[PDB]
């Protein structure tokens, strides 16, 4: 129940490549048996805004990571 670290949640999401909002939220809330950050997220009263921001950040990161590749390397 330490302060929620949005950076850690986005890191976990991009680690598992979960991008869409619903999968992020539900899969995270199901991982509260071992992640102190998960109980930290569940404790807060602004879950929807945080999941919205997490989805957007993961979207940005995947978008740029893909566009960086050159077409030979992409093939």
């Amino acid at each position: 129940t330490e302060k929620f670290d949005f950076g850690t949640m986005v890191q976990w999401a991009y680690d598992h490549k979960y991008a869409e909002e619903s999968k992020i939220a539900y899969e995270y809330a199901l991982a509260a048996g071992s992640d102190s950050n998960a109980r930290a997220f569940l404790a807060t009263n602004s879950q929807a805004k945080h999941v919205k921001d997490c989805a957007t950040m993961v979207r940005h990161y995947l978008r740029a990571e893909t566009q960086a590749l050159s077409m030979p390397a992409y093939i």
């Binding site: 129940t1 330490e2 102190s36 109980r39 930290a40």
Partner: protein, 152 residues
């Protein structure tokens, strides 16, 4: 009398390497009272020490004791925090009806609520094998080194 003298403190230091003035602080006024106390007693047999946890763990909100030594003199250090406050003479009579020794080897002073070593000493002692705890630690140690988020 025998509030706390240099002799008992010297062997206390020789055994547990931390002072009694650093875990408690000062009263030579044998009238001023307190519920919590500290104690180290000399020349005790281990059987009646184990029975000391036995006997005392009636009437105090917490009780910690740990034992030595190495071939040179035994310093059975207690941590006593009664339910109702009792003076140095009253608790002195209690413990010198407890431990079958003289009034000499008693170490009566109130514990010190602001101090780092004052709870580090007992926090280390709590992990010792012969340490015998009962219930919640008193809010002084149980404030100085704990009261931290159990699971963040």
């Amino acid at each position: 009398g025998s509030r706390a003298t240099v002799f008992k403190l010297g062997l206390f230091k020789s055994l547990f390497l931390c002072s009694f003035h650093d875990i408690t602080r000062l009263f030579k006024n044998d009238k001023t009272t307190n519920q919590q106390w500290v104690l180290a007693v000399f020349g005790l047999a281990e059987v009646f020490f184990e029975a000391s946890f036995e006997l005392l763990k009636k009437q105090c909100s917490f009780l910690q004791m740990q034992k030595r030594s190495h071939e040179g003199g035994t310093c059975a250090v207690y941590l006593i925090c009664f339910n109702t406050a009792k003076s140095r003479e009253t608790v002195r009579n209690l413990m010198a009806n407890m431990l079958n020794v003289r009034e000499e080897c008693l170490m009566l002073q109130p514990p010190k609520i602001r101090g780092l070593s004052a709870a580090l000493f007992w926090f280390k002692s709590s992990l010792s094998p012969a340490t015998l705890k009962h219930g919640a630690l008193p809010e002084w140690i149980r404030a100085q080194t704990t009261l931290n988020a159990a699971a963040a």
